[PDB]
Every structure is written in structure tokens, then in C-alpha cells.
UniProtKB/TrEMBL annotation, chains A, B:
Span covered, complete protein: 2 to 119 of 234
Keyword Plastid among UniProt keywords: no
Organism for this UniProt entry: Streptococcus pneumoniae
Transmembrane segments: none
Known partners and oligomeric status: Monomer. Homodimer.
Keywords: Cytoplasm, DNA-binding, Metal-binding, Phosphoprotein, Transcription, Transcription regulation, Two-component regulatory system
Binding site for Mn(2+): D8, D51, M53
Lineage: Bacteria, Bacillati, Bacillota, Bacilli, Lactobacillales
Record-level GO cellular component terms: cytosol; protein-DNA complex
Gene: rr02
Protein's UniProt name: Transcriptional regulatory protein WalR
4-aspartylphosphate modification, residue list: D51
Length: 118, 118
């Protein structure tokens, strides 16, 4: 299956890409909200891992605009861990929301769970 | 025209109701997000003044769920005045966002402007 990893930090993108590859997923990457929508349209990923941050609001907007056309599963990843943050991510269309720093094994388990149910 | 005023503080609702009545609008009021959706469905207001606060997220949700079915103009009113707050209110479907405390004359002017363009 194909995963699009949207992350504006190259070090974190690289860790998730490495771990997802090791599980047998094909990985496409995007580093801002524009590349995220472009890759979403062109690559039709089976799931999207979306960090909230490039700048504060762009992840939420990416998820919002994807949801206009597609039910593709979205797992939001973010250092922001407040109730507001989690609640708003989910209400705007994320299927899950995981905080950083995260466990690589838990992330894999959550991606699997999302793909099973979709 | 008919305005639905959604405000969880009775003193502020009463001021807006008084001022809107004085301009010749018919006013319906709601005091939480449940009553807001109920009144929206039953009364079909021409415009909605929505305060963000009952609890923090419910105004945003009200606007979000109204926008599933209707293009009715929404003016959000809130003591929260940060960039994030204004930006997220508008992205979730508000047509305008006005901070409290507000000028009664400016509010009237903004309601008129919204109704003209709708």
C-alpha cells in the first residue's frame, strides 16, 4: 500500500519513511501543505500521515481540503498534545491523532488499524 | 429578515436582541450549540450571529455542521481575538468574525453587509 508522509522536518520524515519502508509500504513524501495536496492528487495514497506544523493551521487546512473530495485515512502527528488540538484535528477530518515523540511500533500499529478499517 | 443570535451569556444576547429589534429584524435566540442547531433547522434564519463559547469548540462545531447543509451567513462573535482564532473561525465557515467587546453600530453595519451579499 502507499503512504504519503507530510512532514516539514526532514529528520522526522526520514525516520517514518525508513520505518514504513521496512514494513513494505511504498512511501511518497511532502514537506509543506502545497506539496501535500499535489502528492495527494497525483499519487492517490492509501493513507496520509500529516503533521500539523507548517505553520500553525496548514495541517488542519490540508486535512480540510482533502476531505472535500476523498475519504482517504488521515493520521495526524503533532507535538501539540492538548485536548483542543486533538479534538480539532479529529473534527476537521483526521481519523487518528498521535503525539510526538511517538513510538515507531505504535505508529505502525495505528497505520495498520486505519488501513484495515478503510 | 430573521436573525438567530447564539450566545451563552444572557446579558450579551439581550443587548444584541435589543439592537437588532430596533433595526426591524425578527430575532430568535439560542443559548447553547444544541439549541442553535434546533433553531437553525426550525426557523431558517437569514443570518446567524454565533458566539464561539459554550465550551471552547462548540461554536466552531455549530458553524461546521450548519455548513454541511446551508450557505446561511454566519457572523462569529468572540472575546478571543488572536490570528489563529479568527483564521480558524473563517476557515470553518464564518463569513465574518468580530471581537468582543464590539460596537453596536459596527455589528449592525456588518450584519447589513452580510445580508446584502447573500
Amino acid at each position: 500500500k502507499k503512504i504519503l508522509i507530510v512532514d516539514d522536518e526532514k529528520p522526522i520524515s526520514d525516520i517514518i519513511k525508513f520505518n514504513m519502508t521496512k514494513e513494505g509500504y511504498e512511501v511518497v513524501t511532502a514537506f509543506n501543505g502545497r506539496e501535500a495536496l499535489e502528492q495527494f492528487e497525483a499519487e492517490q495514497p492509501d493513507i496520509i500521515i500529516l503533521d500539523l506544523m507548517l505553520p500553525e493551521i496548514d495541517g488542519l487546512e490540508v486535512a480540510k481540503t482533502i476531505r472535500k473530495t476523498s475519504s482517504v485515512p488521515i493520521l495526524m502527528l503533532s507535538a501539540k498534545d492538548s485536548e483542543f488540538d486533538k479534538v480539532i484535528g479529529l473534527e476537521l477530518g483526521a481519523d487518528d491523532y498521535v503525539t510526538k515523540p511517538f513510538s515507531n511500533r505504535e505508529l505502525q500499529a495505528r497505520v495498520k488499524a486505519l488501513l484495515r478499517r478503510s
